[PDB]
């Protein structure tokens, strides 16, 4: 077994690199592989050698660059180019780094340098760092080129993200799904199915993409990959990026879970879909306060939240069919 070690830098960046490990592996093969979490290390056990790993990684980044060139110093509206790169200079910086990694890679040559990691792949990083009584010029934090590129691939292939414009500013909600016990190939590909490309939602009627929890509820409404985590424990790590007057910063880092929300949604949708998906969509669009009450009730299991959400929905435009009421009552138990 390769049991390839993963560098310890940041349990968010470490997650990204050790979790793009698998997407680099699958394109080259590497069957019967597992990912053991160590809190932050996220070690991986595989029966693969290095060459197939490199072929898989270069195939993944070749597809990445093929997608990048489809739109256009070339700036494309991609997840790794402009969808998640909050900084304008990174829009060009990241593709150049990716193509340099390629050019070094097809000729069987290891990397020889290091690059600065944006705040997108790790919110724990930044520009400065308090040493004793002040900060450093430039960016003290830097990572290896191969780890940077492979973490970018892992972020682009698995982790969902939602952008909303609202004029000059822009909210970008970035989520990462993390195991804590054990995963195999099939689970990881099920997680991969969650990722959806070009989530440039913009628009004005869909204004509830602010309040990140509501945005992820909307995204999970239309995601039907698998109900995998009803038997396996998983967590979600979320953060937000803002463009308030060209002032980019991170203003939200709450860490709750993802299992029970979609579990309640999945137990909520047995009866039918024709009155379920439109139900949630109407409550989200019309009764934003009602949707907030509903999501709070899901998060903290309080009876009055469901009643308040239903009342707010019915007041404006929601039909509130009978079967959804029966499903809610069955959820109450």
């Amino acid at each position: 077994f390769n049991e390839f070690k993963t560098p310890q830098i940041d349990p968010i960046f470490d997650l990204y690199v050790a979790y793009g490990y698998v997407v680099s592996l699958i394109r080259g093969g590497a069957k019967e592989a597992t990912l053991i979490p160590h809190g932050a290390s996220y070690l991986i056990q595989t029966d693969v050698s290095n060459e197939e790993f490199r072929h898989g990684l270069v195939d993944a980044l070749s597809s990445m660059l093929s997608l990048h060139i489809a739109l256009a110093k070339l700036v494309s509206d991609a997840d790794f180019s402009a969808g998640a790169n909050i900084n304008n200079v990174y829009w060009d910086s990241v593709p150049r780094n990716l193509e340099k990694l390629m050019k070094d890679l097809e000729k069987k040559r290891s990397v020889k340098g290091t690059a600065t990691i944006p705040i997108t792949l790790m919110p724990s990083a930044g520009k400065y760092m308090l040493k004793h009584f002040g900060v450093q010029g430039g960016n003290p934090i830097k990572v290896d080129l191969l780890n940077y590129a492979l973490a970018w691939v892992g972020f682009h292939y698995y982790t969902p993200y939602i952008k909303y414009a609202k004029g000059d500013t822009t909210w970008i909600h970035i989520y990462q799904i993390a195991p804590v016990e054990e995963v195999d190939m099939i689970s990881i590909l099920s997680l991969k199915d969650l990722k959806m490309h070009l989530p440039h939602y913009y628009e004005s009627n869909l204004d509830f993409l602010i309040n990140r929890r509501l945005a992820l509820l909307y995204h999970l409404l239309h995601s039907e990959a698998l109900e995998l985590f009803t038997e396996k424990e998983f967590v979600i790590h979320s953060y937000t990026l803002e463009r308030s007057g060209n002032n980019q910063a991170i203003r939200s880092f709450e860490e709750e879970e993802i299992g029970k929300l979609m579990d309640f949604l999945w137990k909520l949708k047995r009866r039918d879909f024709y009155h379920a998906i439109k139900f949630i969509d109407d409550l989200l669009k019309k009764a934003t306060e009602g949707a907030l009450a509903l999501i709070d009730a899901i998060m903290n299991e309080r009876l009055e939240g469901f009643y308040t959400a239903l009342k707010l929905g019915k007041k404006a435009g929601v039909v509130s069919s009978r079967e959804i009421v029966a499903a809610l009552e069955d959820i109450i138990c």
Binding site: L189, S190, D193, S223, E224, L226, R270, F273
Partner: protein, 237 residues
């Protein structure tokens, strides 16, 4: 002793499928062969006939699940039973046993999976009111209890009559078929293959159009479907 269709028994239907496939063989086999070189493993047209015959015999074995067939006999609703999942379990395991290869049984399991109609997962816009949804598929999967006790016996019988090499039967409990179908469906949904899978497995789907011939139908366009039922006559007259 079991009955596949409501109007037709297992034999009087499966024999019709197999017989029609004998005529449609020289028409659709070379397309299957040219598709299956792309996979990476290839055999002759006779082994392709064997593979197609196994699919013909094994796509209705899941029909005889002793609860779904009871609903078929009466007018009781079935509410989304996908017996093709158990049939794909059978096909995968039995083809493991006979053909001694790993990818072709996976392809055959998918081919069984689409039989009648494939499953639909993800990327929806609330136009799946019917059973085309993984939640009801998993509902039927856990409510699955077991196949007829004589299923192994008559599976051995049709194995003997169609090939006669060795009789062997897989036994699904409930969780094992769960693992098999989830693994195969998830892997088919995501691999380095992007358009290869759809072309290949739809190509194997195409010859499976004899169901209209097996049971009486009143479709207006079925006559148009009969236009391609037989190939151009080799003899001038």
């Amino acid at each position: 002793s079991c009955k596949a269709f409501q109007g037709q028994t297992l034999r009087e239907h499966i024999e019709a499928m197999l017989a029609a496939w004998e005529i449609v063989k020289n028409k659709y086999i070379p397309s299957i062969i040219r598709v299956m070189k792309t996979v990476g493993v290839k055999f002759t047209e006779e082994d392709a006939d064997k593979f197609m015959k196994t699919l013909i015999i094994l796509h209705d074995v899941g029909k005889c699940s002793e609860v779904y067939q009871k609903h078929l006999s009466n007018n009781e609703p079935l509410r989304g039973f996908r017996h093709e999942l158990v049939s794909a379990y059978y096909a995968y395991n039995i083809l493991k046993d006979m053909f001694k290869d790993e990818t072709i049984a996976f392809i055959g399991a998918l081919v069984v999976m689409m039989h009648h109609e494939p499953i639909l997962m993800g990327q929806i816009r609330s136009l799946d009111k019917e059973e085309l949804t993984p939640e009801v598929v998993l509902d039927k999967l856990r409510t699955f209890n077991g196949v007829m006790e004589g299923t192994e016996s008559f599976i051995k019988s049709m194995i003997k009559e169609k090939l006669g090499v060795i009789p062997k039967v897989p036994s699904p409990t409930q969780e094992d078929v769960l693992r098999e179908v989830i693994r195969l469906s998830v892997l088919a949904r995501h691999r380095p293959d992007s358009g290869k899978l759809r072309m290949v497995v739809g190509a194997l789907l195409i010859p499976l159009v004899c169901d209209y011939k097996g049971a009486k139908e009143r479709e207006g366009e079925s006559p148009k479907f009969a236009e391609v039922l037989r190939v151009e006559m080799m003899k001038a007259a």
